[PDB]
Coordinates of C-alpha atoms and ligand atoms in Angstrom, one line a residue:
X913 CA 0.0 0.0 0.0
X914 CA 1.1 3.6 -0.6
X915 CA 0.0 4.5 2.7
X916 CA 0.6 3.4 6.3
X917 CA -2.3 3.7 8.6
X918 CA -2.6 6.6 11.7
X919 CA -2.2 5.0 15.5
X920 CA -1.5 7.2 18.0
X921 CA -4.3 9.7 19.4
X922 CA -4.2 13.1 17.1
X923 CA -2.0 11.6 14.9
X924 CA -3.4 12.3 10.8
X925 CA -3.1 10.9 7.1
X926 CA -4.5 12.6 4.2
X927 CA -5.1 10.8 1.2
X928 CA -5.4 13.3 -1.8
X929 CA -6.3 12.5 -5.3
X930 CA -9.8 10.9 -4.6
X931 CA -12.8 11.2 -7.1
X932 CA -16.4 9.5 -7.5
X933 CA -16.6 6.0 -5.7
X934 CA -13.0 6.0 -4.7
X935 CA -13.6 7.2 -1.3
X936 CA -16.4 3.9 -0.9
X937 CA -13.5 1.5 -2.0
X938 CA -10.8 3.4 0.5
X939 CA -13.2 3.3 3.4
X940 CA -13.9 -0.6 2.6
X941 CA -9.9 -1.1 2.2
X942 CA -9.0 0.6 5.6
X943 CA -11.6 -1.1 7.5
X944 CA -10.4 -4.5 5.9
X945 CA -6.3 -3.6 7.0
X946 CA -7.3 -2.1 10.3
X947 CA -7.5 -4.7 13.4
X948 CA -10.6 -2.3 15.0
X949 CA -13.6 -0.5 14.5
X950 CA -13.9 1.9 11.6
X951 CA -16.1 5.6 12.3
X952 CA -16.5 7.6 9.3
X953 CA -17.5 11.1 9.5
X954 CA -19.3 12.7 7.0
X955 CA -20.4 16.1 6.5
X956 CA -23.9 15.5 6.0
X957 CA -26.9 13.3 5.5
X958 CA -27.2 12.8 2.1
X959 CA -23.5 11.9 2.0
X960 CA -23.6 9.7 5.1
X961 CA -26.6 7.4 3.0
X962 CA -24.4 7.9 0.0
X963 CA -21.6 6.3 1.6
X964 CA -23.1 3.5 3.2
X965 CA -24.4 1.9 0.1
X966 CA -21.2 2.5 -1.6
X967 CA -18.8 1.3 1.1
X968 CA -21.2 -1.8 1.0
X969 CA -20.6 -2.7 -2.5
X970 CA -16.5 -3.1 -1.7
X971 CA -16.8 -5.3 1.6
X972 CA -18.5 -7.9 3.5
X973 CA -17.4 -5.9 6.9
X974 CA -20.5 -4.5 8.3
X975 CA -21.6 -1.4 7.4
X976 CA -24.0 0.3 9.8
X977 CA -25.4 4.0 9.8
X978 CA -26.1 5.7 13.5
X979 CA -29.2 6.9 12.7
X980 CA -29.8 10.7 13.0
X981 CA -33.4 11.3 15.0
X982 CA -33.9 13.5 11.3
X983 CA -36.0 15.8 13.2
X984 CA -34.4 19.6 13.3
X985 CA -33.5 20.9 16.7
X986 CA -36.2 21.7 19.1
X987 CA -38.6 20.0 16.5
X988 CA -42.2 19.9 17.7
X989 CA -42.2 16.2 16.4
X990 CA -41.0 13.1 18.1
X991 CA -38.5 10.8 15.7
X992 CA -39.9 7.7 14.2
X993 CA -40.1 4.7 16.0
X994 CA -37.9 2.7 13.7
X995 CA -35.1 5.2 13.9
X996 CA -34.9 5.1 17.6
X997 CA -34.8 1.4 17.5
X998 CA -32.3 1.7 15.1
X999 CA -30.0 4.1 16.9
X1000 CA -30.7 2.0 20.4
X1001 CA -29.3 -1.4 18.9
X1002 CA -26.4 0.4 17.0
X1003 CA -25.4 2.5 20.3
X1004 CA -25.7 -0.3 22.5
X1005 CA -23.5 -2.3 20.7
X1006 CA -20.8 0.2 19.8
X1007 CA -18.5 -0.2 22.7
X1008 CA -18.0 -3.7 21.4
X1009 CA -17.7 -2.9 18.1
X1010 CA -14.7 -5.0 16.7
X1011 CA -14.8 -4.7 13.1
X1012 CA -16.7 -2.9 10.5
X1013 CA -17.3 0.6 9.7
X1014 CA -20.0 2.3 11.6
X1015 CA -20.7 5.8 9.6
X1016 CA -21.9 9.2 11.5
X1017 CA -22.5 12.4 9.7
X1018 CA -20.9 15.4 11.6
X1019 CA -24.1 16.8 12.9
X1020 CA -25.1 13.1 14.5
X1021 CA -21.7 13.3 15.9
X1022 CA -22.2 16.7 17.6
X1023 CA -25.3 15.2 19.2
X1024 CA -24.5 14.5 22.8
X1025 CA -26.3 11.0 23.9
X1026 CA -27.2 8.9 26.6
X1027 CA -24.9 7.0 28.2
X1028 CA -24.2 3.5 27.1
X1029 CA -24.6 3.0 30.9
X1030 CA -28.3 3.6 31.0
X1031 CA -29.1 1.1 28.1
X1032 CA -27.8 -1.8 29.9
X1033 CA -29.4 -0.6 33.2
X1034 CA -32.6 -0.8 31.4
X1035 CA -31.9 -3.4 28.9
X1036 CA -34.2 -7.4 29.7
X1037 CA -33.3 -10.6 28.6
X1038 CA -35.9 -13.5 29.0
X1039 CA -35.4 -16.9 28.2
X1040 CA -37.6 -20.0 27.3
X1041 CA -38.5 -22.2 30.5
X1042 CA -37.7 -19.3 32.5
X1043 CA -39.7 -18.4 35.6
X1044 CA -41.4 -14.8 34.5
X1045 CA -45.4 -14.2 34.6
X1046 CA -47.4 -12.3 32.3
X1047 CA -48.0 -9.7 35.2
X1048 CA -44.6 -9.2 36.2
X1049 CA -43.5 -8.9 32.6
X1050 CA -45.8 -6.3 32.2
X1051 CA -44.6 -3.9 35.3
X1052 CA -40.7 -4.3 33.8
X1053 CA -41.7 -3.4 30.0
X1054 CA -44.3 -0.1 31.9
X1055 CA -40.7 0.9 33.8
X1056 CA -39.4 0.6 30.6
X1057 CA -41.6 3.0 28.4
X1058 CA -43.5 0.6 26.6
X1059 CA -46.7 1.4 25.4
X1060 CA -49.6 -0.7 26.1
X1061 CA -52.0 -1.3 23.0
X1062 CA -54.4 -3.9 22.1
X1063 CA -52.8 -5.3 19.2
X1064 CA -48.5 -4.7 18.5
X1065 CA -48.1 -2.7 15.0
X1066 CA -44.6 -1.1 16.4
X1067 CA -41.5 -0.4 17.8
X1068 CA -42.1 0.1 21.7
X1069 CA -45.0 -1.5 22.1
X1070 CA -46.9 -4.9 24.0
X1071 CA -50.0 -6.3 24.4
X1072 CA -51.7 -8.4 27.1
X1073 CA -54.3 -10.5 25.2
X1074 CA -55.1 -13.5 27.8
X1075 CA -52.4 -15.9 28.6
X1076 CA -50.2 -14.0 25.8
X1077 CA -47.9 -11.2 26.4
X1078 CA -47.2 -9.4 22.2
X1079 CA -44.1 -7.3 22.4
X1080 CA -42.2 -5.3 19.8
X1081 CA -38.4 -4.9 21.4
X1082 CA -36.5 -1.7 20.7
X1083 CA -33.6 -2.9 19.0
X1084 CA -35.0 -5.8 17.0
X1085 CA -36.1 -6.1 13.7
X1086 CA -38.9 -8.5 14.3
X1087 CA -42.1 -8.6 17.1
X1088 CA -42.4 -11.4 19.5
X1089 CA -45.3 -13.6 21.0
X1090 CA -44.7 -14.9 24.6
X1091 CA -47.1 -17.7 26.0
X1092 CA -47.0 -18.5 29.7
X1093 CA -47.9 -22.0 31.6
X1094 CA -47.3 -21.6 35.3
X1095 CA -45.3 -18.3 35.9
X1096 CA -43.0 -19.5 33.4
X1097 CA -42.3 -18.6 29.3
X1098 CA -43.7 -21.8 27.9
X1099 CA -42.4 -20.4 24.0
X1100 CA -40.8 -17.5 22.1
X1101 CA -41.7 -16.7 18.9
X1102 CA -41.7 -14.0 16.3
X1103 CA -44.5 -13.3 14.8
X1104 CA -46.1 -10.5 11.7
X1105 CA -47.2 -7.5 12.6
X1106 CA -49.3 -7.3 9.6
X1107 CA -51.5 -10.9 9.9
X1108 CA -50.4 -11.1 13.6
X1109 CA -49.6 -14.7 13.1
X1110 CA -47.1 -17.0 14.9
X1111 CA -43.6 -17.7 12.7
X1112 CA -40.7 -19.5 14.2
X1113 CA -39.4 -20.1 17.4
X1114 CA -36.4 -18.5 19.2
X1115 CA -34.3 -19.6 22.3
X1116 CA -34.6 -15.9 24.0
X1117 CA -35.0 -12.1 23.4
X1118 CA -33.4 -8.8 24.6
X1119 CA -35.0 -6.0 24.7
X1120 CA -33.9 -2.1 24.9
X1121 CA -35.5 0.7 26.9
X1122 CA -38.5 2.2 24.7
X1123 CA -36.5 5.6 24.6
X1124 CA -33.4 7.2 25.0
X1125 CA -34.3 8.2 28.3
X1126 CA -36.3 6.9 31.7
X1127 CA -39.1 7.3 32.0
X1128 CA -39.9 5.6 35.2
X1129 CA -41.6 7.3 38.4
X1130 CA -38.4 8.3 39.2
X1131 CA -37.2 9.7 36.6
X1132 CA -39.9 11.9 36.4
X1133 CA -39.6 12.8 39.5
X1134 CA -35.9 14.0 38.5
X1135 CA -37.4 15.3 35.4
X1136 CA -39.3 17.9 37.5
X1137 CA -37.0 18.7 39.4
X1138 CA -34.6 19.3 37.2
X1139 CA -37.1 21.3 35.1
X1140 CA -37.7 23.3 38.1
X1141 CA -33.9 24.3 38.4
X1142 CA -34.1 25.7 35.1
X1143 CA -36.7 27.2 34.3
X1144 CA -41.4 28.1 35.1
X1145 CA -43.5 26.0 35.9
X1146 CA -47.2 27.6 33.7
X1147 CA -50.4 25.8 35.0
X1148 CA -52.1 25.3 31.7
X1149 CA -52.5 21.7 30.7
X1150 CA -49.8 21.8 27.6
X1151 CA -47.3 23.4 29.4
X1152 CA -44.3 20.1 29.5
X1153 CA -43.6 19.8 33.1
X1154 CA -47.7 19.1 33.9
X1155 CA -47.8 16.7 30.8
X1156 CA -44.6 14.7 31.6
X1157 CA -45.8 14.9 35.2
X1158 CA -49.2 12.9 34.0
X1159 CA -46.7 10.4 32.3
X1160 CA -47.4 11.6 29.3
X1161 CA -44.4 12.0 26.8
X1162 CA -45.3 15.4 24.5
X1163 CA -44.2 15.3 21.4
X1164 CA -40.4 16.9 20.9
X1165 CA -40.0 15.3 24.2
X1166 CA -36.4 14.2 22.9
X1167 CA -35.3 17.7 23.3
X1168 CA -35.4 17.6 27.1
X1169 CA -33.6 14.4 27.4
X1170 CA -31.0 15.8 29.6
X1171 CA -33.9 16.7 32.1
X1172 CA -34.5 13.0 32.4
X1173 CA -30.8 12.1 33.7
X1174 CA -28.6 13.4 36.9
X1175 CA -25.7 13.8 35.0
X1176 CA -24.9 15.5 31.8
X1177 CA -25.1 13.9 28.4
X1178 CA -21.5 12.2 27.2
X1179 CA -20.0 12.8 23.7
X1180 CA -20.5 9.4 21.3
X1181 CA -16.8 9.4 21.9
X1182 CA -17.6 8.0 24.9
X1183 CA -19.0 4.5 23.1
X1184 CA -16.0 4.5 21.0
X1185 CA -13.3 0.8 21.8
X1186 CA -10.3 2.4 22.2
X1187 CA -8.6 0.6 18.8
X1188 CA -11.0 3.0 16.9
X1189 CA -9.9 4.4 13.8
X1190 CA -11.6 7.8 12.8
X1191 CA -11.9 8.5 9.2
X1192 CA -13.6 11.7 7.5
X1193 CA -14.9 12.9 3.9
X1194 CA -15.2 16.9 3.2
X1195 CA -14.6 19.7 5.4
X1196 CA -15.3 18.9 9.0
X1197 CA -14.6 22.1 10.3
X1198 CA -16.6 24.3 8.0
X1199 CA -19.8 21.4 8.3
X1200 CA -19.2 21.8 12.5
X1201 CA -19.5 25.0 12.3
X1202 CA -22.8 25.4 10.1
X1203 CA -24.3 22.6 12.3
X1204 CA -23.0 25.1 15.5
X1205 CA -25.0 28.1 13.8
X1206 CA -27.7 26.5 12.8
X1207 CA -28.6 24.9 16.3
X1208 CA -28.2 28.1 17.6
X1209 CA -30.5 29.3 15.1
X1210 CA -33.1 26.8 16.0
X1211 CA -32.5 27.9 19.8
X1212 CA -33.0 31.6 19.3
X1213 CA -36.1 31.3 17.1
X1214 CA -38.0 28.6 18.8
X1215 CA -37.4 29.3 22.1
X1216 CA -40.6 32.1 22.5
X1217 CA -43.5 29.8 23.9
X1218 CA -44.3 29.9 27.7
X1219 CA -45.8 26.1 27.4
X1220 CA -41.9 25.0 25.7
X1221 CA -39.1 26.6 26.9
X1222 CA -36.1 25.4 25.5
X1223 CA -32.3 24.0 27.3
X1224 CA -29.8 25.5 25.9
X1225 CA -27.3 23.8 22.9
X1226 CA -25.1 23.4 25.4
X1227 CA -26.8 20.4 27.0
X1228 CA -27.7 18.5 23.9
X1229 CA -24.5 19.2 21.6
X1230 CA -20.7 19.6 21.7
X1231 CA -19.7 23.0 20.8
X1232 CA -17.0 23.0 17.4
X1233 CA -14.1 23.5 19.9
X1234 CA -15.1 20.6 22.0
X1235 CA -15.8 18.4 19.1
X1236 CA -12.2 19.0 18.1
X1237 CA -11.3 18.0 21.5
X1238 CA -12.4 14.8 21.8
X1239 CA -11.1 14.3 17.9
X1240 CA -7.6 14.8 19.4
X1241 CA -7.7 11.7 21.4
X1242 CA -8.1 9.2 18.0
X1243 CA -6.1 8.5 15.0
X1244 CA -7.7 9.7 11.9
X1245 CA -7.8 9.2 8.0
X1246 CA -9.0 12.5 5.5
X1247 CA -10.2 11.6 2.3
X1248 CA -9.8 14.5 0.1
X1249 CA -10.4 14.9 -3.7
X1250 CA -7.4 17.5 -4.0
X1251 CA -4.2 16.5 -5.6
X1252 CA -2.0 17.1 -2.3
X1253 CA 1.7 18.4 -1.6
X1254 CA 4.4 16.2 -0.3
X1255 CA 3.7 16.3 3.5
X1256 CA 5.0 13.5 6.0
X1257 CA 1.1 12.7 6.7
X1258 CA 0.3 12.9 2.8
X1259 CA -0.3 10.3 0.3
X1260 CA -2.1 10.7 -3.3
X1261 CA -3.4 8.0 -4.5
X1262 CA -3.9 8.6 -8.1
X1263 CA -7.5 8.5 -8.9
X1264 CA -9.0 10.2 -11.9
X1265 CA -12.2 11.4 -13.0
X1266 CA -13.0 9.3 -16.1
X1267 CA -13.0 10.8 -19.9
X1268 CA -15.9 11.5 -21.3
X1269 CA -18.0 8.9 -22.6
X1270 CA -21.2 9.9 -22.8
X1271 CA -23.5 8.5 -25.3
X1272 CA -25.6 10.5 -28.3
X1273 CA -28.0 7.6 -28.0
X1274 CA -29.6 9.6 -30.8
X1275 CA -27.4 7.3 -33.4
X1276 CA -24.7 8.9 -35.4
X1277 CA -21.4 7.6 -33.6
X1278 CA -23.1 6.7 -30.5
X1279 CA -20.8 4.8 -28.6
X1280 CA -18.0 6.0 -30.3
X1281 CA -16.7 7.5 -26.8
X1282 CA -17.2 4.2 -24.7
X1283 CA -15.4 2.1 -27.6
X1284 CA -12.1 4.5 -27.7
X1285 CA -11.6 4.4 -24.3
X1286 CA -12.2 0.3 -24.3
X1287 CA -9.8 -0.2 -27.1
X1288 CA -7.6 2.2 -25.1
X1289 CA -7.1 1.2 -21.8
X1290 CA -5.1 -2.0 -21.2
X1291 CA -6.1 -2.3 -17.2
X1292 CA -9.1 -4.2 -15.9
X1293 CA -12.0 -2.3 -16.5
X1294 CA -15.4 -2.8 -13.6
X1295 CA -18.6 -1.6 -15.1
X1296 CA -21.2 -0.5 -12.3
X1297 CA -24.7 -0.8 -11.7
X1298 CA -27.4 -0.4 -9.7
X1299 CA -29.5 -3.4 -9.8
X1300 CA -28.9 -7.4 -10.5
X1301 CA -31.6 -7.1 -13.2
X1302 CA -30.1 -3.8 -15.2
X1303 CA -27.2 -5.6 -15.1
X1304 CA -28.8 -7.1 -18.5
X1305 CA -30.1 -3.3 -19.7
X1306 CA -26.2 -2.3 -19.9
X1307 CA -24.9 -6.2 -20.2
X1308 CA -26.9 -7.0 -23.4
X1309 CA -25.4 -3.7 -24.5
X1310 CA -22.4 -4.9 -24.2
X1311 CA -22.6 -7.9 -26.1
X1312 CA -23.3 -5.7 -29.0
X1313 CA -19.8 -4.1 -29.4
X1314 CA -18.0 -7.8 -28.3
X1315 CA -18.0 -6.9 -24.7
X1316 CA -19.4 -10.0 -22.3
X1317 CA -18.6 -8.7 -19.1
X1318 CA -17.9 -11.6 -16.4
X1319 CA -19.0 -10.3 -13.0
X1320 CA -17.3 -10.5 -9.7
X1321 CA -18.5 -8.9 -6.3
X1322 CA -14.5 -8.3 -5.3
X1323 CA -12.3 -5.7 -6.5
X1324 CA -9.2 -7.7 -5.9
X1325 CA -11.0 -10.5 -8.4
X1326 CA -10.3 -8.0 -11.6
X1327 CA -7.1 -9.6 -12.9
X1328 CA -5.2 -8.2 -16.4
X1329 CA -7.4 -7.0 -18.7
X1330 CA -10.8 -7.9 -18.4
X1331 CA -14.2 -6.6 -18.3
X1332 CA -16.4 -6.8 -15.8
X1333 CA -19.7 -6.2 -13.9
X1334 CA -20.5 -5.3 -10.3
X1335 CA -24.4 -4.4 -8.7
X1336 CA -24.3 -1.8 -6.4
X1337 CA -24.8 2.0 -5.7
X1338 CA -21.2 3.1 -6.8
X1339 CA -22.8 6.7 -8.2
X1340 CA -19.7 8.1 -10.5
X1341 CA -17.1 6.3 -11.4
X1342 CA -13.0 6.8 -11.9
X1343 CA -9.7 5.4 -13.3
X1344 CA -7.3 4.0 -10.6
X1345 CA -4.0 4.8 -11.9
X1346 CA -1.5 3.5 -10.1
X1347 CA -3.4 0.1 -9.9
X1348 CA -4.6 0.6 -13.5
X1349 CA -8.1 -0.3 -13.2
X1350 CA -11.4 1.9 -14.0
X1351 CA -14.9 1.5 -13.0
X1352 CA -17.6 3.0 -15.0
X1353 CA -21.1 3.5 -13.6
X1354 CA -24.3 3.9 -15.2
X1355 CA -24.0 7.7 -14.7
X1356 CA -20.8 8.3 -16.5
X1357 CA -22.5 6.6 -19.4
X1358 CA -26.0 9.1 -19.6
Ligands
LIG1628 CO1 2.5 16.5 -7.0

């Protein structure tokens, strides 16, 4: 490899010369050579969605996104049930992380959370043959914010129906039915939400708390307490302190997490194994800082109603200077698309944006573009696409000007000079230089 990998806390590598997919394959190759966990930063969300269906193309590490709440700050809406379940089973097992590239967009990162402490404290485990009743059961999963419906349709949820107890763990996928002979779980099994009927059966469960908070009579008795240290008390109905007094969660609750705990929130950093290696796309200084003034901006402009005062950024998110801080204790790789000096930390690696082959599928000398650069280029070259079908919209096409592309799902499986297909969401594609390979995606084609 042209370039070593970054160990010690603070320490930096850029790698320059990166264009289209090339940053997917990088972020594959580094979380295949490092012996750890792999966060990637990027700027946004559209780039953080981007980058998980790319990077997922080039390995078969895991490739998980922590899921934003993708409400704005101090957002009179709660977050989606599946994206809390979502960020619950990724948090909760991040500190064991051991492989694989986890991917956070700067503004998620900024977010301060709960600690991983409280998951655990909350978290339940029940086995088959094991000595819980319906009743108690149903005390543990109220303690736990679980909502109590007739019939399980989400995330958060359970039902009591006769010697059943439905449940929908936060953190799972899938809903489970529990039947009970003698104060014991006689079976476990998942069922469908959307016929309610019984599928297979499973050895045990875990479940997660139903939020990322308590919301137990305690901790709403620290709630108001709290709230009372900080700011009025109004007696009208909507005001937050008499609705969360009622145990009623208003919506936007989320906002006032940091009411619900003693201490204050921790950075994600916090979740981090220590043999983390960071890595970042664009410009995570200029992206900290919009975040910075725009939650500001969200504080100053929402923060007007009697019934909803607002906690200041502060308690929800890391200022830019502290975010900085807690990147000084990890070793980190930037991905940049600039060709770069000669720097101890610097490495290009030679990627190119491809020629131009677009078609005039209006038929003159249509492919005239795409057959030069074929007859060309004595590497490997990887045609990409989106889908295992179009595969054939692009492959029969290729049988027309002698091209019969053998496919592969591995980079490293491009030997001499072939051609060759790969499904995935690769957007733009590029010409690898120094290894002497291109991959062309649908897009550089239209
Ligand atoms: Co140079």
């Amino acid at each position: 490899y042209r370039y070593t990998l970054p160990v010690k806390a603070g320490e930096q590598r850029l790698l320059g010369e990166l264009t289209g997919a090339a940053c997917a394959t990088l972020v594959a190759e580094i979380a295949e050579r490092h012996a750890g966990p792999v966060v990637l930063i990027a700027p946004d969300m559209q780039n953080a969605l981007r980058l998980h269906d790319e990077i997922s193309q080039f390995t078969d590490q895991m490739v998980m996104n922590l899921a934003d709440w993708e409400t704005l700050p101090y957002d009179s809406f709660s977050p989606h049930q599946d994206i809390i379940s979502s960020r619950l089973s990724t948090l909760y097992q991040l500190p064991t992380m051991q492989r694989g590239v986890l991917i956070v967009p700067v503004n998620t990162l900024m977010q301060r959370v709960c600690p991983h402490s409280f998951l655990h404290g909350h978290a339940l485990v029940m086995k088959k043959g094991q000595r819980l009743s319906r009743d108690a059961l149903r005390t543990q999963l109220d303690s736990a914010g679980y909502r109590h419906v007739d019939q399980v349709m989400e995330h958060g949820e359970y039902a009591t129906r006769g010697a059943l107890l439905d449940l929908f763990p936060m953190g799972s996928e899938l809903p489970y039915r529990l039947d009970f002979f003698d104060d014991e779980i006689d079976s476990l099994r998942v069922f469908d939400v959307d016929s309610q009927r019984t599928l297979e059966e499973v050895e045990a469960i875990n479940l997660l708390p139903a939020h990322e908070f308590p919301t137990d009579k305690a901790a709403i008795e620290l709630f108001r307490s709290q709230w009372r240290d900080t700011f009025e008390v109004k007696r009208d109905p909507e005001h937050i302190y008499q609705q969360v007094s009622k145990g009623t969660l208003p919506a936007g609750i989320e906002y006032w997490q940091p009411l619900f705990f003693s201490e204050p929130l921790p950075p994600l950093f916090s979740y981090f194994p220590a043999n983390t290696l960071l890595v970042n796309t664009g410009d995570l200084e200029t992206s900290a800082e919009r975040f910075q003034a725009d939650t500001l901006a969200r504080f100053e402009n929402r923060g007007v109603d009697p019934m909803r005062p607002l906690l200041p950024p502060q308690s929800l998110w890391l200022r830019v200077d502290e975010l900085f801080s807690e990147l000084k204790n990890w070793p980190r790789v930037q991905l940049k698309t600039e060709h770069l000096p000669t720097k101890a930390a610097n490495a290009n690696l030679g990627f190119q944006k491809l020629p131009d082959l677009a078609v005039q599928a209006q038929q003159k000398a249509p492919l005239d573009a795409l057959r030069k650069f074929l007859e060309t280029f004595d590497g490997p070259v990887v045609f990409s696409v989106e889908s295992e079908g179009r595969r054939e919209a692009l492959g029969e096409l290729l049988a027309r000007i002698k091209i019969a592309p053998q496919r592969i799902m591995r980079l490293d499986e491009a030997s001499d000079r072939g051609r060759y297909l790969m499904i995935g969401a690769a957007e733009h594609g590029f010409v690898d230089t120094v290894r002497n390979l291109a991959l062309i995606c649908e897009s550089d084609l239209l």
